[PDB]
């Protein structure tokens, strides 16, 4: 991967590749499987931005079929500790933690382009019998947590999430808004 | 992959790579498979040149075979959005998602050169319960129809006519993207145009 | 005879037992429905005891060993030992109703099918899903005596049933224990 | 494996595999990791013997480190099934569903040899998959599983559900005397003047 | 991993990668398995932000599911050893090892988001003679004990605690490791903090 | 063990079987439950055809599992009849404790025999609560076997102890000197 | 060592080479030829630069290659300035060697360190000649670490050798009192 | 390998394999590596021959390039044990362990024939702790040592001649062998034999 | 491998990795095996150092098993072409070719640390393939090579070719003091004091 490398100005004309220069614009990118080290890159950002500016709203771009819940939380707490509103686009595709992630950011500020591929479910995956209940146990939990926290942001009731995320669910970008996934479809530069 | 360094003048004179070079000139590149990597740097460009000046011509070169349908729909609504005119030209191949980029150029800023090669298909995959092989059957369904349509608004015909000519591949040479719809003109040499 | 299995498998043939252990292939099904006809020329009269201890495997497979089980006129009587699961459990709740047996401690699981091109060959792939989903769910049903509903039910995930619970749902009839007739 | 062959005469001199030979005696062989097809082997042989002669006592020697539940579980069933005494012996070890299986013979006819291993512990799965409903599924159905055995086990022993739970938690080592005392086995052997 | 680059303007306007800015600010991260490396890396850190001001506090994000002890012993005393006190901040999950540092933070400045994960466990070792094993037994042993004892007094509580709720993984939401004495605070947002 | 060759009595046998049929059994190569419980069925066939003739064990073993190795002991001390043990090229490990084990007298080796004790040695587990129980266990075993072979050489358990801290290897006149064998045989002149 | 950060002094610098510039080096895990040979190259700057001033030698190693080790000891030796070292994490095998090694008084642990100490262990040759030249080469290192471990410790070589035999884990402590270090740190106070 | 079935006649007619048929006429053969099951191969087919008849020769046909020498020595004690002298004949090789057997046997009936190859040389392994390896080389000396004494022996000549001599590969004519004192005679074809 | 980067001051302060610093105090270092590739940046730097200063003495530091053996002689004849003196230094090991450029540095100036290591033998190979005909030229050529070699170590050892040829018939440890006695190395270093 070559990223492109851009000229600014701004007294003194810096170079510099084409996704720190969109960092400028307060754009964010969530891209691919989440990870440890994938997350907390957001998580680097999502804090700089905060430091450069607590008022200006940061605009979050999720094209991900999901990954570590572990690793998804630490983006999700990030972006309700920050000051900032954290706006979140879909582009693409946000599936598992990636919709959950997308329908996180601030209410009003949730959007979708026309032909995004939006996917909830529930979770996905040894020892001796005591680890294997202790682990399902938690395994429960945290289905329990993302349901409920899934029922807040779409302003729904827990036993419509439960039921909707029980086997895979898709939904185009109309089906999301209608959900309360996102708050609005993007088309062009009109909204 | 060594990319060549070059240089620019015009009160100061930097050195790119020939690629970043070729981006200021607002020329952008999909070339090979689109993944999400290479799609997420497309939009990149594509969003950089649009706030450069939202109101030049974007020239989206593509040599490309397909890839993941979401990542190549993250670069069309991408390219639908954003208010420059975000014109296409086929230099080697376009086929599947990379034709469908293609054909999703500004209409009347399509473009091949001559021995281009364009080809069109329905989806084709490479899972478990029966319950949840159902919701992605059907799901399969719903985008290739979608997929459809969308290539028949870009080519100006029936729904009908995409649900054959995609039922399995369907190589095209320059001229025939052309009465397909699929392109505009068929870009011979620079002197004509 | 021998046919792949031991002289001990050879001599309990004699005294018309026929074993599937192990997952369900063309192979260990036809070997099965050689069995059944084979006894059934032996005597078509006389009970064959079809002895099950399978996690299943290959519906067409068993299928096979479901139709010669209904085709010959002796009876064959199931009896579940160690587990009877997907397949096997069919193959066990298909024995003649009031010579369906399991043993205290076996393990019977049913559920709906599990699976390991263009668009178009996986509509059709997925429709033919469904017609087998539905298929083994109504015959289910009939060996069970219960509603179709009820087996759509029961089998959207694993069921582990003990067998006392296989006797309650219908499929099987008694828990075998030492010598009791 | 070669295994060897052997006469049997007397009013007609045959020739056995020796394992055949013991086979004629009674003698069942459980060795090595139980599996479906290891079991069911046996479980073919207690059948033949009952069948054979449905009074006498079966005498079934294990030495095996355990193996698949299913498996074993088909061949309990099968030795409180049939109408014989199955009395069992520990040579070498008897691991986890091995030593399940020696101690469910016949009260009174559960062997060990001197030097044998026993060791009882909880299940343990390689592993896991699917969705949570399915992990819960599962989870739920091993808990049965771990409770049947430990049930089971305690009648074996004469113990409290409560002390197989405890005993099990962690791999548990014992020597012949130390699994007679735990009441796995009845007697120790050690040679034929006993 | 392409970290993404940023300006800072103070006498002089210069270019950082995003985790040099961060670390401009006291801000350390121990994110994935701990390695030796990736925990010299942090030791590394803690030892240039005492130097640059030894009396500002150090905060130190966690978001790891655990490795080498060892490894974590030299990040461990190396934040004993130095004056700043380290803060420590659970993002995402803080497992074994990384539970450990994360107790290992200055009272009253350790802290998890509300959706952390915190889980504690015995040691487990991955992978010669009856005298070599039992040298390598005893010596986990003593491992074991001093891990205990080590977060007996990170918690309060007793070792026999410990050793006890250490046996099987011992999962906690941020809220049950702050009433188990091993975080003080959950920060919500900028609620007071 | 290619083609096992026949040869006739009265009627055919594989050789081994043969041999067999004169109360001469093998062990040779690694010890494993399958090659160790066909010791143990040689040895109960043999004893039943007749309980008071000696058996003759011919021991080629670098050894193997303890467990497979206890197994053809208590066998061999669980039966009438004396089963004298004979060394041949090697008994190594488990090898070298079953060949001590024949019947004391009748225990042999040849002269350019190859015989070697030690201590267990493990290959390469999980939580340190199992790893504690196994370690225990291992080390139950390693003073297990030392007081048995003490036993078996009339010698201080300490002794054995101390000298099978590390591989030791013993020519056929040490392991005789040792209380491991008897006699060293050559010819039939004896 | 995913991206080495960068801080600021008039310069940049990534952090290991602003840590070099104040005579702090690292040792961290295996000793390889390119590990332990940039240590040599740093310890020959830092001499350079100051000739006089001590140098701190950080060791988190689990040890490795014994050539490779002898390199770092003799540059360590050899240069004019005192090099300090300071054990976190662990020093083991060849890196408790280079541990020991560090200017007597000037050799730390930290409170949680481990330290471990053990004769010559090799993985797994041809001709029973080169076999023999081989393991005679073998003892002449064991026998030579042995000896300036002992000279490093202030022990007698008998001791060494008895305390080396097996893997002999030391804590902090037990690593101040056999010799081996001098001081525990913790905190600034001190 | 599909070994061909002969039948003989006397008293009764009966089928062998050819292996088992050659047997029958006290002959023996090591074919290939000398490895421990193979090596009991040939000692039980000693044991068989010597109880057939102690008195008649053994004819031990050798074509092996060596292999273990426990499992060598194995054979080497059972035919220095038994009563019948062990003929042997090398055909088409005798190397390291299978020219040790070639020439331990009977003197006065160590043959080759014209064209076998006949090597000779030390020992040669394939593949812990300096103690355990200092053991193990001090066991290999005395092995080296036995071997070449019992060589020179079977030889006669000096161990300091063998010492020197398998020092390396030593390849050797039938009628180098022959000279060397490790076969008697060389068989041409039914001379006077 | 992160090397680490350094500052040169006064008249100008400039930053280099840190080799490339070791470079300019004419201090080359052959680390690990002789690859072509690593053995030319060996001569690339002799000859980069002859360019700056053909008088001043050039410092060879080796810490190297061996390797190639054309690619060896490469540094070799370059050693010996150049103006300057290499003066080597061998720290850790210096075996086979290794120990071979190690004793081809200019006489006087050839040394080794106290702990080193010093290791030589003859050529071996790994292996072979064709006809008879090209397995005896490649023979003929290895026992040229391998004479050219004993000859070559004889001279820098002041030894008859007879001597070398025995002392590498098999591996042939030396400690330092036995390397300054073959006649491998001048001095053996122990600190700067000296
Ligand atoms: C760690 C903490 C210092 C921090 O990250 N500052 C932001 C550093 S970036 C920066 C700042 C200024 C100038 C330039 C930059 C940049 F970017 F250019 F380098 P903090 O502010 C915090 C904690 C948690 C989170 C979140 F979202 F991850 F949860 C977010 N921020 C903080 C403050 C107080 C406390 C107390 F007192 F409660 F302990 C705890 N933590
Ligand atoms: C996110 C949004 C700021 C954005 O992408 N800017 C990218 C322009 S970067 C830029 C800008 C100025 C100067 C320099 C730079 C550069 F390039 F050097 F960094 P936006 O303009 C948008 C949305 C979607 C897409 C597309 F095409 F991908 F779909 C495209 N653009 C936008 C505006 C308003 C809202 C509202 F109203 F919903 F909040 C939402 N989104
Ligand atoms: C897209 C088009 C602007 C283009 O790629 N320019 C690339 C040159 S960048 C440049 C320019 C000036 C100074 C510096 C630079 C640089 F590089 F240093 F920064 P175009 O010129 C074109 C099309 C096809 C091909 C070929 F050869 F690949 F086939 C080639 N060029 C073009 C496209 C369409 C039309 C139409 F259809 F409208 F007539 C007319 N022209
Ligand atoms: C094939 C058929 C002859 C058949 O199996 N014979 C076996 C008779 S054994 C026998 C008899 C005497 C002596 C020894 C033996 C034995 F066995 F010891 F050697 P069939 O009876 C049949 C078909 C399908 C199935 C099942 F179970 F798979 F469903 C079962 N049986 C049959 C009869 C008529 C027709 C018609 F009418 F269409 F022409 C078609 N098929
Ligand atoms: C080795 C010691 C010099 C050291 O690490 N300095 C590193 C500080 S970097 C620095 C400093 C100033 C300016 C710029 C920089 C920078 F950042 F730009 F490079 P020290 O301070 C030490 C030891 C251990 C630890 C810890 F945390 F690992 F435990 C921590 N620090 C030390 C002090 C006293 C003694 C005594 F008393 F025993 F002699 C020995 N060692
Ligand atoms: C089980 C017992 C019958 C048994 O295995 N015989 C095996 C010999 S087969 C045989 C027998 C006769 C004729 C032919 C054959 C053959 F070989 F041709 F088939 P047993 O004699 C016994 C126990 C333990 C061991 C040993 F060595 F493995 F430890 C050995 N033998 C025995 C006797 C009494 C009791 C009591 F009274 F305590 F219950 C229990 N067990
Ligand atoms: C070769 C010798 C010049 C050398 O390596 N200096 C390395 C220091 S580089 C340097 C120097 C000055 C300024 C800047 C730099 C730097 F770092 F920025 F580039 P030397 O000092 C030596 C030998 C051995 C070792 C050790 F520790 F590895 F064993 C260490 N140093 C030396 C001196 C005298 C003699 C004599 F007289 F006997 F020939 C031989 N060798
Ligand atoms: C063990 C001993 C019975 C033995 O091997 N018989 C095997 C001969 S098979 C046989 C025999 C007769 C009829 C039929 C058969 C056949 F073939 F059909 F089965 P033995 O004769 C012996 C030991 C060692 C070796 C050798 F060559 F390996 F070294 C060789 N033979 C023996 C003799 C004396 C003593 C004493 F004196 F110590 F008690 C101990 N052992």
Redesign the interface.
């Known amino acids: 991967?070559?990223?492109?490398?851009?000229?600014q100005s701004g007294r003194?004309?810096?170079?510099?590749?084409?996704?720190?220069?969109?960092?400028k614009?307060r754009?964010v990118?969530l891209?691919?499987p989440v990870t440890?080290?994938?997350?907390?890159?957001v998580?680097?950002?999502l804090?700089?931005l905060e430091?450069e500016n607590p008022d200006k709203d940061i605009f979050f771009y999720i094209?991900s079929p999901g990954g570590?819940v572990?690793?998804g939380?630490?983006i999700?707490?990030?972006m309700?500790?920050?000051?900032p509103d954290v706006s979140t686009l879909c582009?693409?595709?946000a599936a598992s933690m990636g919709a959950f992630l997308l329908s996180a950011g601030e209410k009003g500020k949730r959007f979708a382009?026309?032909?995004?591929?939006i996917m909830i479910?529930?979770?996905?995956?040894?020892?001796?019998?005591?680890?294997?209940?202790?682990?399902?146990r938690?395994?429960?939990?945290?289905?329990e947590?993302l349901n409920r926290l899934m029922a807040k942001h779409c302003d729904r009731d827990l036993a419509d999430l439960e039921r909707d995320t029980?086997?895979?669910?898709?939904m185009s970008a109309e089906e999301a808004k209608e959900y309360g996934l996102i708050d609005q479809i993007?088309?062009?530069?009109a909204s």
């Open positions: 991967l070559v990223p492109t490398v851009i000229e003194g004309e810096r170079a510099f590749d084409i996704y720190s220069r969109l960092l614009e754009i990118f891209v691919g440890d080290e994938s997350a907390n890159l998580v680097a950002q804090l700089f430091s094209n570590s572990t690793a939380m630490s999700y707490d990030t309700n500790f920050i000051k582009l693409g595709q382009l026309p032909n995004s591929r479910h529930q979770p996905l995956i040894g020892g001796q019998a005591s680890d294997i209940e202790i682990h399902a938690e395994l429960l939990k945290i289905k947590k029980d086997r895979d669910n898709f993007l088309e062009n530069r």
